[PDB]
Amino acid sequence: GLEERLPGGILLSTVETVAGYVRKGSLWPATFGLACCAIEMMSTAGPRFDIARFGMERFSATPRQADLMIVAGRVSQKMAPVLRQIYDQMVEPKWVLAMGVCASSGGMFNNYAVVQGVDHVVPVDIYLPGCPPRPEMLLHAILKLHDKIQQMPLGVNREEAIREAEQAALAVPPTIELKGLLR
Amino acid sequence: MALYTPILILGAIAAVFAVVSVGIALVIGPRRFNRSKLEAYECGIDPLPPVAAGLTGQRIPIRYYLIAMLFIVFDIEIVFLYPWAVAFDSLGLFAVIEMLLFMLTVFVAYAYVWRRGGLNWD
Amino acid sequence: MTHPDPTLFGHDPWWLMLAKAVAIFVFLLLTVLSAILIERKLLGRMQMRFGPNRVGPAGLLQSLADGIKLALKEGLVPAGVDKPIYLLAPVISVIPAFVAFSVIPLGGAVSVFGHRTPLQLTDLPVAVLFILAATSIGVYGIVLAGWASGSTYPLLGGLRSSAQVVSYEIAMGLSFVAVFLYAGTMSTSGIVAAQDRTWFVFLLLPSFLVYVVSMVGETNRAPFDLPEAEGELVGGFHTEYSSLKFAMFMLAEYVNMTTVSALATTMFLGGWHAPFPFNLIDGANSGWWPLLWFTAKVWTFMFLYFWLRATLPRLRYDQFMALGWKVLIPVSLLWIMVVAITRSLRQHGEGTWAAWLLTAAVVVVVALIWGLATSLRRRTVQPPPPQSTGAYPVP
Amino acid sequence: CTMISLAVLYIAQDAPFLGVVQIVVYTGAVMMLFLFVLMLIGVDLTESLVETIKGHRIAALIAGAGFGILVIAGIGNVSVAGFSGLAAANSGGNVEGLAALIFTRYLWAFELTSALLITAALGAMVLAHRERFERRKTQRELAIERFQTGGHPTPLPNPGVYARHNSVDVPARLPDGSESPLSVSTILP
Amino acid sequence: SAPLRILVYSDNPRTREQVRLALGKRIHPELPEIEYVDVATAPMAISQMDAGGFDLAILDGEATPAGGMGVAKQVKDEIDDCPPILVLTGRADDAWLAKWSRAEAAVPHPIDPIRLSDAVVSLLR
Amino acid sequence: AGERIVVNMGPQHPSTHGVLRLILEIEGEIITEARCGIGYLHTGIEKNLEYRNWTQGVTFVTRMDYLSPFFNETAYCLGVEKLLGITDDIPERASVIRVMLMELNRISSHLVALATGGMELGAMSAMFYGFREREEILRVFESITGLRMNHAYIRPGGLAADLPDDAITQVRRLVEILPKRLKDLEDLLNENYIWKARTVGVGYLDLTGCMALGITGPILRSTGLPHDLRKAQPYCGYENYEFDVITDDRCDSYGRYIIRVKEMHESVKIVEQCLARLKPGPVMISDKKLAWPADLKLGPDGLGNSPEHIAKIMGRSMEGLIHHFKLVTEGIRVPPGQVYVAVESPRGELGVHMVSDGGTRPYRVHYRDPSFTNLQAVAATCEGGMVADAIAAVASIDPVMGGVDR
Amino acid sequence: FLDALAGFAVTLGSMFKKPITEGYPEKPGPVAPRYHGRHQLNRYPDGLEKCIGCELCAWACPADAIYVEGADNTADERYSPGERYGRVYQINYLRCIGCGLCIEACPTRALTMTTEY
Ligand SMILES: CC(C)=CCC/C(C)=C\CC/C(C)=C/CC/C(C)=C\CC/C(C)=C/CC/C(C)=C/CC/C(C)=C/CC/C(C)=C/CC/C(C)=C/CC1=C(C)C(=O)c2ccccc2C1=O
Ligand code: SF4
Numbered sequence A: 001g002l003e004e005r006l007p008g009g010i011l012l013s014t015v016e017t018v019a020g021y022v023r024k025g026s027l028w029p030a031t032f033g034l035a036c037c038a039i040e041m042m043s044t045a046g047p048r049f050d051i052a053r054f055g056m057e058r059f060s061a062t063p064r065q066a067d068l069m070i071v072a073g074r075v076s077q078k079m080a081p082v083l084r085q086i087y088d089q090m091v092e093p094k095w096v097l098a099m100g101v102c103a104s105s106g107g108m109f110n111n112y113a114v115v116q117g118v119d120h121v122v123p124v125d126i127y128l129p130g131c132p133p134r135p136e137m138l139l140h141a142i143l144k145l146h147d148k149i150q151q152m153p154l155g156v157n158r159e160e161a162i163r164e165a166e167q168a169a170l171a172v173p174p175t176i177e178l179k180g181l182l183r
Numbered sequence B: 001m002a003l004y005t006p007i008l009i010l011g012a013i014a015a016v017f018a019v020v021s022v023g024i025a026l027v028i029g030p031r032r033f034n035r036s037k038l039e040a041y042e043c044g045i046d047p048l049p050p051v052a053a054g055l056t057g058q059r060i061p062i063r064y065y066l067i068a069m070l071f072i073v074f075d076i077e078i079v080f081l082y083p084w085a086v087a088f089d090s091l092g093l094f095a096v097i098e099m100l101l102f103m104l105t106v107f108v109a110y111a112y113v114w115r116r117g118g119l120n121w122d
Numbered sequence C: 001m002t003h004p005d006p007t008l009f010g011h012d013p014w015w016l017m018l019a020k021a022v023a024i025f026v027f028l029l030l031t032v033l034s035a036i037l038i039e040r041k042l043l044g045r046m047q048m049r050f051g052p053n054r055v056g057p058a059g060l061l062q063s064l065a066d067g068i069k070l071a072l073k074e075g076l077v078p079a080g081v082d083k084p085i086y087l088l089a090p091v092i093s094v095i096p097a098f099v100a101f102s103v104i105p106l107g108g109a110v111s112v113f114g115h116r117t118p119l120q121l122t123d124l125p126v127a128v129l130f131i132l133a134a135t136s137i138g139v140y141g142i143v144l145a146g147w148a149s150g151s152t153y154p155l156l157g158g159l160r161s162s163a164q165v166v167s168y169e170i171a172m173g174l175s176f177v178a179v180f181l182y183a184g185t186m187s188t189s190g191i192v193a194a195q196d197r198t199w200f201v202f203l204l205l206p207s208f209l210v211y212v213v214s215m216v217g218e219t220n221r222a223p224f225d226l227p228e229a230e231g232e233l234v235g236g237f238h239t240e241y242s243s244l245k246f247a248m249f250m251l252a253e254y255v256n257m258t259t260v261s262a263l264a265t266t267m268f269l270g271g272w273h274a275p276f277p278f279n280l281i282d283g284a285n286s287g288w289w290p291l292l293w294f295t296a297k298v299w300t301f302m303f304l305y306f307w308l309r310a311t312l313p314r315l316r317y318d319q320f321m322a323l324g325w326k327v328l329i330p331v332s333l334l335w336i337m338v339v340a341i342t343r344s345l346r347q348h349g350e351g352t353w354a355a356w357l358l359t360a361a362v363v364v365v366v367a368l369i370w371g372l373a374t375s376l377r378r379r380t381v382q383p384p385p386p387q388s389t390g391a392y393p394v395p
Numbered sequence D: 001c002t003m004i005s006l007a008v009l010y011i012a013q014d015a016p017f018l019g020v021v022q023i024v025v026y027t028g029a030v031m032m033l034f035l036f037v038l039m040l041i042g043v044d045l046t047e048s049l050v051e052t053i054k055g056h057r058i059a060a061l062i063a064g065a066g067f068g069i070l071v072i073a074g075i076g077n078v079s080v081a082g083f084s085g086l087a088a089a090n091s092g093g094n095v096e097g098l099a100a101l102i103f104t105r106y107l108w109a110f111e112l113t114s115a116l117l118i119t120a121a122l123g124a125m126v127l128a129h130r131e132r133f134e135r136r137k138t139q140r141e142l143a144i145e146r147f148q149t150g151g152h153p154t155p156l157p158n159p160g161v162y163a164r165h166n167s168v169d170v171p172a173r174l175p176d177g178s179e180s181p182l183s184v185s186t187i188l189p
Numbered sequence E: 001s002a003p004l005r006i007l008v009y010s011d012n013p014r015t016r017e018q019v020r021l022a023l024g025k026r027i028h029p030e031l032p033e034i035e036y037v038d039v040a041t042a043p044m045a046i047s048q049m050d051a052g053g054f055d056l057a058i059l060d061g062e063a064t065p066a067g068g069m070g071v072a073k074q075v076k077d078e079i080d081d082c083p084p085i086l087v088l089t090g091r092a093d094d095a096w097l098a099k100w101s102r103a104e105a106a107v108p109h110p111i112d113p114i115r116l117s118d119a120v121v122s123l124l125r
Numbered sequence F: 001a002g003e004r005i006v007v008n009m010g011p012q013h014p015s016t017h018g019v020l021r022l023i024l025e026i027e028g029e030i031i032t033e034a035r036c037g038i039g040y041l042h043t044g045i046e047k048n049l050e051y052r053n054w055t056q057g058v059t060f061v062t063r064m065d066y067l068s069p070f071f072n073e074t075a076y077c078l079g080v081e082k083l084l085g086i087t088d089d090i091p092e093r094a095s096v097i098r099v100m101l102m103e104l105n106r107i108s109s110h111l112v113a114l115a116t117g118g119m120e121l122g123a124m125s126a127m128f129y130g131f132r133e134r135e136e137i138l139r140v141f142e143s144i145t146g147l148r149m150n151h152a153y154i155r156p157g158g159l160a161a162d163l164p165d166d167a168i169t170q171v172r173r174l175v176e177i178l179p180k181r182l183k184d185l186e187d188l189l190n191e192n193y194i195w196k197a198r199t200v201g202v203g204y205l206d207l208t209g210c211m212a213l214g215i216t217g218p219i220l221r222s223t224g225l226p227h228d229l230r231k232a233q234p235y236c237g238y239e240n241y242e243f244d245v246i247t248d249d250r251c252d253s254y255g256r257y258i259i260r261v262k263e264m265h266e267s268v269k270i271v272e273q274c275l276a277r278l279k280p281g282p283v284m285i286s287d288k289k290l291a292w293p294a295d296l297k298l299g300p301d302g303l304g305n306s307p308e309h310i311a312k313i314m315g316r317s318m319e320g321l322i323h324h325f326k327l328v329t330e331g332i333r334v335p336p337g338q339v340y341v342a343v344e345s346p347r348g349e350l351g352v353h354m355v356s357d358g359g360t361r362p363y364r365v366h367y368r369d370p371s372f373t374n375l376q377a378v379a380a381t382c383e384g385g386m387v388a389d390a391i392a393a394v395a396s397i398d399p400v401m402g403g404v405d406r
Numbered sequence G: 001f002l003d004a005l006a007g008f009a010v011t012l013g014s015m016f017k018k019p020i021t022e023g024y025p026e027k028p029g030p031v032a033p034r035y036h037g038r039h040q041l042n043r044y045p046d047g048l049e050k051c052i053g054c055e056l057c058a059w060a061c062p063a064d065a066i067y068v069e070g071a072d073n074t075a076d077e078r079y080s081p082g083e084r085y086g087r088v089y090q091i092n093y094l095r096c097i098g099c100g101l102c103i104e105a106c107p108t109r110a111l112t113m114t115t116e117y
């Protein structure tokens, strides 16, 4: 959008900060949930907690209105195409919260049927441990995503950030090479 | 002209607001082409092959068609009440009786439709 | 005397009437923001929650945050949509929503910058039906949005919107008849003036109830909510819409809620007249206080909307149409007769007879409707017959 | 659009009630006609509009143009013969004057509109209303058919789910590798 | 001839090194020289694909923040006339998803140099 | 014929629980054919069980039909114990706590069913009030087990640990408040005109249909048949409890909803009985060859093996150390054999076919989950009605897709 | 007849009762004392690590979420009493299911589970 054509002066910085504040608030989750993690997501929406306090009570039934896709449960092989379709049918900017161990790495179900982490099919922004994560853990992960969204760049700043993140990522060794103290 | 130009001004404000809102929707925010994004939402399932049959290239029956047909006539008929209602005091008893006869005729029609199952289906 | 009063309307200079139009538009914008925020917080309270209380001080910016986010969100134009009508449907929904409010009396005459003008953008000889016409145009927004999306769920949502029109519009129209009979005019200002002695909510209670049900129906609000029907059609008509197009559909919905609540206030709650606890106060009905009273009444109606949403499930649209045609329309028509006969008798000195008929009529109707609620909807049925599946033995 | 524009013109011609009623009733009527278009023609069917009757299109256009031209010629200049301001009649209320005329000078036609409504309702009830001999079976009825709905071809196999294909038009794979007919609804191509 | 440009996407640098080892400067002396563009993040890979000028993309299905299969589906849905996509799968059972990603070819981990080279030749031929 | 659309209720839909795929042929908006699409939540739990020991597959089974964790755990543990021939050796306190937790879990699962059904049918506040009650229930569950869901608290031969000292008081408070707070939820729905109109006569399924599809639970008992595995084929000592099998004769969605609402009160009564009969004692079989050796206790460093157990195994008891090591690492060995054990889960007969090949891992564990069988009634309870009626019918079926796919 | 409206009386009533929401994150709610929070490796009062690297926690983990490598407590560098200590100890919290089998498995109480989440 034209907000991405703005010059990199103070104008772009203020547009970025206001857009981040606006998007961190009103972060409507998609009406999407796979398993017991979906039950904990509902509990988070439930009175004991209040997802609504964060402007996130409107679980967008359609992906068009959804801004955040809380996977919230295990993703089977047959479901990955559906989850990717839902992700693609959301409109940018989009974010994916991998709620629970099943959504983030497959969790305990390390077998043929489970995808072993939704990042196999959709870009994940935050991983949320737990099986299921208790609602406070979900709110913590959501606030972490809010912090990430606030510092989200735009336009030329976005391009520079992408280049810098690429440069940093090209150098990190794989986890299999962090042999610290391994005999 | 008077008593309406305020309506015209408010309509101009609202139309400018709405068209500019559509323009902002199309022009502000990210835009990235994606065939999966643009295709019809079907609860995550692949949309039916384009073709045309049994829907878009076909018809969607409404089961309250009868009530729609009745709605046309009843809506156009009730509007007689408005001038009658406003001028009620000035018209006098004759107009009251005339409108009561008209309303009883409408009631006969309504009762025939209702009791013969016309208000059934949706 | 004659309403709209020619001594008050049609004399605002171009700048003053432009200022009033802009003020009404800004008032509707602020009222929509407040309606959304207050609805979310009141739903929270009615559900033991707090609602938005983090985005800005006490969550005051939550509605603005959502609006700007929708602005900052990608404007989708899905393939397979009838692009021209698909892009127009939001505008068709929005424009009538604002237009209808042009004839709402927010207050009485007031002097601003040396000009005596009504605290009201304008008034018409047929203002109430002008509001009805504008709202009726607005529904084409919903229906064409559902149809133009080129998808099953939006199509079903638009079809439900059309069914809802069939269900509620005739009842809405018939509700105005008693109001006109007692006020003798279609101008909103004239209707407000006619309620100086007493508010029509007490005099025309059946009309008020039918109108209120039709209000909730017209605004696509729970427990009717049919065109959206989140639990049934995902997003209903506004599926396949994103960003400010969806934002404008919802803005039109809320502006319609406000407009029709203000119309209810005008026609039944004495418009901007101060309530009884403040009516005795000198100057309450004069100056800018009428604006406060009108806003208070409108917001009581908004609270009724939110309360209905929190308490009631949503009807099937066939059930809503049955309510409209088997209950609302017959009740409103019987009430129109009863009222006409009553007023004619009173004008001819019949007196007691009217006081009898009216009561008897309502006594009958509340019974007959009860039958439809209890007798027609029988709660007993016969058992089914067995088949090849070798059913077990029942208790 | 045409109806709403004509309503605006009526308002401009000192007929406010008529214009507003136009908007209301024609909004309703065009909504119903749109419903019947979806029901009877098609949701998004694009008509060919190719002249099916040989030479009928040209003849119809010629006849229409000639009729319009002749009508306009017959109209000629009329307002040149005087144009009374309607303000005299609308004085005391346009709706008030309409009420005075309708229920005094034209009460007979007003009542006959009731006969028109009754005839329309009767036609709807006779031609369009279906009756017991063809009423759709209720969910209760369908469930109770030797337990047909759930036990007689117990809910039919879902459409097959394949990598790259999961739409309802995809048949499921039988063990022998052949596509199961029951998996895909018979209507689908 | 034009140096065929190949996009190698993997958060794991060792997977990129193995892919570049299997495919030398020339897969065969009959084929053109090969230039490799290494991308570790999905945003960079998507932007490079949008810039175009690639003859093949090797996407690691095991990439941590955004899997190769997801990126393959995204690029084939978002870039017009996108080059053939080769996906590296972390397990045999991923084959189904590899088919879903519509990748022209799938090579299981661990990356067999010869299998990868043959698949690349088939895709470029 | 050519005038009916075919649509996907699809996995991603508010009423389809995210993984259920109803494919509906709608003539206008009447469901003509209703195909059911399953497996979007298949997980391989049944196969993955085979590579973990007993007392470990518990953590797997609790995650299929995740709204009824204690029921899955109890079915699994009863199967293991029956294969061991140990069912009669389980401590009385363990059985009483099992019944108490199963009934509290029945209340919780019915609360979730009512919440999601009301949300699907527009009853917005129904979800919040149901989850408010479920919040107290889950507080009790968390205090007892340390987890809010997918508990692994019921273990082959007893429980994972004894109740905390405050557990009895919390459960008594639940017995006190649950009826009053369920009153709020019942007032929203029970007699509400819209709720009854939206569910009465919807999703009809006669007793013949229930038998033909093998339906069970509230759906079957909405036909008036008082079939309940707690009375017929009693387990965990349910025979010692005075409670009435809730059953209705409407055979529709509203009857099933009322059955669930009344089952909540029956569960409250059973929990009161459990508290009355709850007496101090061991919660795990006395046979040290099978008993779970862990002894969890709290301290300033958190929850962990009690210092007394640490002293016993690492300081003085070689046999104790060997038993702890082996029963924790390999686990018990279950004599070879097959056993089919069934319980009355909130959604019907939850059956478990358990086959042991004499090893330390379950050779085969299949869950006949009631939701899997009940979903076969979607065609019967949806065809003919409107999509709005289909939503109510499916919600009345109350399918938890974790149990459906497993 | 008013029974059908009972729901209204509910919601309105709750509108005047104090909301029951926990104030997380500003005022986090009280978790159960027994809650299965993050694993924690504990020390003896003198500072020695309790973990002897027996791998029983990892052994019992259903999700293979623990990796442990033992090593000798040489006199030059002792980390735990006895012959063995766990020099490498990793928990993959994206595989942890919080079951608590690990702590029940430990023979030293070196592994506990706190209430931190
Ligand atoms: C153009 C311009 C910028 C103009 C300037 C002015 C301006 C800024 C704008 C003017 C004002 C405007 C237009 C503002 C824009 C915002 C706007 C118009 C409106 C949007 C905000 C709005 C509508 C607010 C209220 C919405 C609302 C009432 C929200 C509450 C919804 C609720 C109750 C959500 C809770 C749902 C919930 C419990 C979620 C869980 C979903 C789950 C778990 C899914 C998966 C799942 C399901 C579904 C199960 O049920 C389930 C059951 C059993 C087992 C498993 C599962 C399972 O897996
Ligand atoms: S992470 Fe745990 S709670 Fe979440 S879906 Fe997987 S098994 Fe269920």
Ligand code: SF4
Binding pocket: G050, G051, G052, G053, G054, G055, G056, G057, G058, G068, G086, G102, G105, G106, G107, G108, G109, G110, G111
């Ligand atoms: S079981 Fe305890 S002592 Fe043994 S390796 Fe694990 S943490 Fe260390």
Ligand code: SF4
Binding pocket: G039, G057, G060, G061, G062, G063, G064, G065, G066, G091, G095, G096, G097, G098, G099, G100, G101, G102, G103
């Ligand atoms: S809580 Fe359970 S899954 Fe997590 S590390 Fe401990 S034993 Fe493993």
